[PDB]
Structure 1
Amino acid sequence: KIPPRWLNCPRRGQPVAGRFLPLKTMLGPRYDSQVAEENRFHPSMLSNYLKSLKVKMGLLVDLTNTSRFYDRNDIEKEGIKYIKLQCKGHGECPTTENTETFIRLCERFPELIGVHCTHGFNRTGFLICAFLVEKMDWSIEAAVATFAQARPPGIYKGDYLKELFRRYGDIEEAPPPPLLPDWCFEDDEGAIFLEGVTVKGVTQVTTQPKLGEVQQKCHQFCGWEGSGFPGAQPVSMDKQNIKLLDLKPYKVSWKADGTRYMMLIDGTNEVFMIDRDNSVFHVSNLEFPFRKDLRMHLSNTLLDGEMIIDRVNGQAVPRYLIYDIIKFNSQPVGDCDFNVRLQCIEREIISPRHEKMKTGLIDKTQEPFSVRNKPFFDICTSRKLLEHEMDGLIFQPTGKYKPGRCDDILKWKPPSLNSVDFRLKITRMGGEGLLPQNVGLLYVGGYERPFAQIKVTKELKQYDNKIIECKFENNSWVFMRQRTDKSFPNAYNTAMAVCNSISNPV
């Protein structure tokens, strides 16, 4: 019927009564195609935060009634007992039988006790408070208040609190559910704009009214049925494929390594950037004048391109290359020929701005970044391109604009640097082959065994069971940087895709 959410909640609350650690559910690395640094909470990160504090976690109680979130062996291989405690469904509260089971279990295993449901608020808080009232002789008021302060929102289902007070206090004194984070009851419909540089006039749009409107207009301009970023996605290239690239007079361009951004020009000060994560950024001082009326401004215009970092020695200058246009004044230019749209960019976007750039009415040193268009050439000259800085070649057919995955937009980008995300659990051998021989094991998503091994160093033990960016080179995974808030690796399918790229590169 009605929805829960997962991405924005804290990974853990404060310990309750010095015994219980409330948690949201860990997820397996099987989901890493859906999540990353900000919103990845992984069993190794938990066991590892505990190891770094020299704390053992005893028993972990799973209240989710499911095994699709993570592998229990990731918890049990660390010496932590794992129990899956089935609770009453249909949105009802844990029964007295469920509470008795929880109390019987928890009175066995100083060490913490981890308790988690999908979110770590309602079932977790209910069972923890019941344990506090019975086992620790707390008052129900104190237990509820302490859980509300420890887990930052706390229990927020009214019937949960009413049943707690009916069982352990006066039901007429049960508090109403707390006012939820107004900001968190919102992901129902990246924070850094450009990595490495700070850009003026560009501020992220989190305002709930206008964010959905900008996303909606982009959807409708692209004709995108599903949810998410509507821009065209170029795909991998490696096969007998360059002839396909010369089938529909494709144009070639060098691909600078940049950040994908569609630009929606909706009005006077309404200039917005949209990245692959559907995040919206408002640009202030970018002016797009109408070609015919230089005083008037553009509306209902959608662009596409990359944000690249140019280096004028001593400082890095941001640049936005427009390498396609979807709509112009509501005219579906995206349905026209790719040459027609290239001319539309040049003649209706760059030229009207460049007229006022020589009149003094537009000052380029005021604008947030430089706006240019990406040159395209025939493939006959692409061969010469193989004979600002490009990490590869893009390969664009001359047909009409298509959203989503484009099997016919081919990416040809020099690799030789293909990292992978990898959970690094360092294990010293003890057992059959009892040797010093302590090797760091790298793990991936939905794959129970280690995916690879990494040579242990003095530096590497720093991030153990952590997440550690590892480039591939010289037939070895090489640590490059810690992904300091991502929890454990990328999915096994993603890792295998990377490896397929490295061994059959483009």
Structure 2
Amino acid sequence: GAIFLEGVTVKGVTQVTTQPKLGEVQQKCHQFCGWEGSGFPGAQPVSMDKQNIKLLDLKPYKVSWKADGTRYMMLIDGTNEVFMIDRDNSVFHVSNLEFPFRKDLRMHLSNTLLDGEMIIDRVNGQAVPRYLIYDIIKFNSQPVGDCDFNVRLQCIEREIISPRHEKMKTGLIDKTQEPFSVRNKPFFDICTSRKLLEHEMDGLIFQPTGKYKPGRCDDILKWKPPSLNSVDFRLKITRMGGEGLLPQNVGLLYVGGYERPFAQIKVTKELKQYDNKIIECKFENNSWVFMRQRTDKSFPNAYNTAMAVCNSISNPVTKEMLFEFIDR
């Protein structure tokens, strides 16, 4: 959606609508991911419920703190070719980000695909953009995504953060020139995850150590404290009555890939303001509750993502309960 980062304004970053290169940057990301369908190829994590958590016993898992951020895959195809892709498949061209090849420090990266969030860090008085690299799909055409989540975590460290961090002590690369701060997200064993329950996080993520998968991953688990559970709906306000008379007018909430409305929202003075727009709602008191408009999404959550959140809110995993599952 046309806004790259919500609330922050960001240099060097300009949405790509050019008909020719758009369908291309999109094209290359499917192919790198093995994505058969249309839409954003990146792996989608599902909310932990009491049936999910049992999965943390059945194989090796890594944890990390989830900062609330905007999902972006980053395709490094060339010299000035650096693109971000959000969940909508919207593309953005980044200018001054340089990714030097590890062996030849003069040479530049091609056929690389990244995954991560854009997060807003606050250095007091001003908010600084950071892009955390939380996975890598492809490197120089080598299917690193087929390797071990620990193999790939190193790729990210050794093949990406390091070659850039050499030219960052050489004066050949100026970090005050670049659009945003490029970092990698730290992962731990579940053991130490408990301790994390004992920058800023609205929750935890649990990564299986397996090969990278695109699409819904029933096995990547997002845990979130039950009151912070939310869903992105298309809000369409329709005034209606049939022959059954009263002209009441109710806000209908919509999700992706379900045709009828998913829920209803009580109309208010304030709400009409964002209509036909996208709205993030928290669930409480047996009602969806408008919380903040979402300017970065041209699209609402998927019906399957939505149901997933409800599954979670009606059969929740409490902080303690998760604590007590990791511990012993």
TM-score range, shorter-chain basis? 0.7 to 0.9
Residues 486-495 or 233-242, more deviating: 486-495
C-alpha offsets along residues 240-268 of structure 1, whole Å, 9 cap, x if unaligned?
43342243321111111111111111111
CA distance in 1, matches of 2:51, 2:119: 30
Q: TM-score, normalised by structure 2?
A: 0.80
How many angstroms apart in 2 are the aligned matches of 1:272 and 1:404? 20
> Structure 2 vs 1, CA of residues 345 and 246 (structure 1 numbering), >3 Å: closer, same or farther?
farther
**Native 8 Å contact 2:6 2:295 kept in 1:** no
Deviation at 1:397, TM superposition (A): 1.1
Rg larger in 1 or in 2?
A: 1
Distance 1:364 1:378 in 2: 32
Whether 1:475 and 2:321 are equivalent positions in the alignment is no
| Distance change (3 Å), C-alpha of 1:269 and 1:501 | same
Equivalent position of 1:374 in the other structure: 185
> Per-residue deviation at 1:356?
0.8
Of residues 12, 20, 25 in structure 2, which corresponds to 1:214? 25
Mark the CA change 1:222 to 1:254 in structure 2 (over 3 Å): closer, same or farther.
same
The Cα shift of 1:402 comes to 1.6
Aligned to 1:114: none
Structure 1 residue 428: Cα displacement: 12
The answer on whether the counterparts of 2:241 and 2:248 sit within 8 Å (CA) in structure 1 is: no
Q: Relative to structure 1, is the Cα distance of residues 314 and 432 closer, same or farther in structure 2, using a 3 angstrom cutoff? A: same
Question: Once the 2 structures are TM-superposed, how far is the Cα of residue 496 of structure 1 from its aligned partner?
Answer: 5.2
CA deviations 1:379-416 (Å, max 9, x no partner) are: 10011111111111111111111222222211112241
Distance 1:476 1:378, change over 3 A: same
- Which residue does the alignment assign to 1:175? none
Alignment check: 8 A CA contact 2:46 2:308 kept: no
Separation of aligned partners in 2, 1:289 and 1:487: 34
**Further displaced range: 302-311 or 214-223:** 214-223
Quote the offset at 1:505 in angstroms: 3.1
1:394 is paired with a residue whose SS is strand
Against the structure 1 CA distance between its residues 319 and 423, is the aligned structure 2 distance closer, same or farther, given a 3 Å change threshold?
Answer: closer
Deviations 1:455-491 (A, max 9, x none): 7877678889998765333455444456799999989
Distance 2:36 2:102 in 1: 32
1:165-210 C-alpha deviation (Å, 9 max, x unpaired): xxxxxxxxxxxxxxxxxxxxxxxxx111111111100111111221
Q: Which whole-Å CA distance do the structure 2 matches of 1:297 and 1:446 have between them?
A: 40
Q: Distance in 2 between matches of 1:394 and 1:465?
A: 32
* Residues 417, 473 of structure 1: 8 Å contact kept: no
Alignment check: 8 A CA contact 1:426 1:438 kept = yes
* Change in 2 beyond 3 A, CA 1:243/1:270: same
CA shift digits 1:29-84 (9 cap, x unpaired): xxxxxxxxxxxxxxxxxxxxxxxxxxxxxxxxxxxxxxxxxxxxxxxxxxxxxxxx
- The separation in 1 between residues aligned to 2:170 and 2:70, in whole angstroms, is 32
Larger deviation, residues 470-479 vs 300-309: 470-479
**Equivalent residue for 1:279, pick from 90, 114, 128:** 90
Q: More deviation in 366-375 or 489-498? A: 489-498
The answer as to whether partners of 2:6 and 2:296 remain within 8 angstroms in 1 is no
Q: Is the 8 A contact 1:246 1:379 kept in 2?
A: no
Matches of 1:278 and 1:194, distance apart in 2 = 15
Does structure 1 conserve the Cα–Cα contact (< 8 Å) formed by 2:88 and 2:297? no
Shift of 1:365: 0.4
Question: TM-score under structure 1 normalisation?
Answer: 0.53
Judged with a 3 Å threshold, the aligned counterparts in structure 2 of structure 1 residues 388 and 299 are, in CA distance, closer, same or farther, namely same
Summarize the Cα distance change of 1:217–1:239 in structure 2 as closer, same or farther, 3 Å threshold: same
| Whole-Å separation in 1 of the counterparts to 2:71 and 2:298 | 25
How much does 1:502 deviate? 2.2
Give the match's secondary structure for 2:231.
Answer: coil
Give 1:342 shift. Answer: 0.8
Preserved contact between residue 47 and residue 224 of structure 2 (Cα < 8 Å): no
Asked if the contact 2:279–2:294 (Cα under 8 Å) also holds between the matched residues in 1, the reply is yes
Q: Contact 2:88–2:299 at 8 Å: present in 1 too? A: no
Consecutive unaligned residues in structure 1, runs of 5 or more: 1-189
Mapped to 1, the partners of 2:221 and 2:214 lie a distance apart of 14
Is the Cα–Cα contact under 8 Å of residues 2 and 296 in structure 2 kept in the other structure? no
Q: Secondary structure at the match of 1:464?
A: coil
Kept in 2, the 8 Å contact 1:232–1:405? The answer is yes
Deviation sequence 1:200-257 (CA, Å, 0-9, x none): 0011111122112212221221222222211111123212433422433211111111
Are 1:245 and 1:410, in contact at CA under 8 Å, matched by a contact in 2? Answer: no
* Cα distance in structure 1, aligned partners of 2:204 and 2:77: 31
Q: Tell me the SS of whatever aligns to 1:421.
A: strand
8 Å CA contact retained: 1:248, 1:399: no
> CA separation of 1:456/1:387 partners in 2, compared to 1, >3 Å: closer, same or farther?
same
Equivalent residue for 1:299, pick from 110, 117, 132:
110
SS at match of 2:227: coil
SS in 2 for 1:364: coil
Cα distance change, pair 283–241 in 1 and its aligned pair in 2 (3 A): same
Cα deviation code 1:395-452 (max 9, x no counterpart): 1111111222222211112241345578999999999999999999989999999987
Structure 1 residues 496, 210: CA separation in 2 closer, same or farther (over 3 Å shift)?
closer
Contact 2:279 2:293 in 1 (8 A): yes
Aligned to 2:138: 327
1:260 match: secondary structure: strand
* Cα 1:386/1:268, change in 2 over 3 Å: same
Structure 2: how far apart are the matches of 1:357 and 1:347? 15
Cα 1:365–1:399 shift into 2, 3 Å: same
C-alpha separation between the residues in 1 aligned to 2:262 and 2:84?
Answer: 38
Provide the C-alpha distance between the structure 2 equivalents of 1:431 and 1:209, rounded to a whole number of angstroms: 48
For this pair of structures, how many residues does the alignment match?
317
**In structure 2, what is the Cα distance between the partners aligned to 1:485 and 1:304?**
18
Give identity over the alignment, percent.
100
What residue ranges of structure 2 are gaps of 5+ in the alignment?
A: 318-328
Conserved in 2, the CA contact under 8 Å of 1:253 and 1:394?
yes
Counterpart secondary structure, 1:214: helix
Give distance in 1, aligned partners of 2:41 and 2:65. 23
Query: 8 Å contact 1:288–1:353 — kept in the other structure?
Result: yes
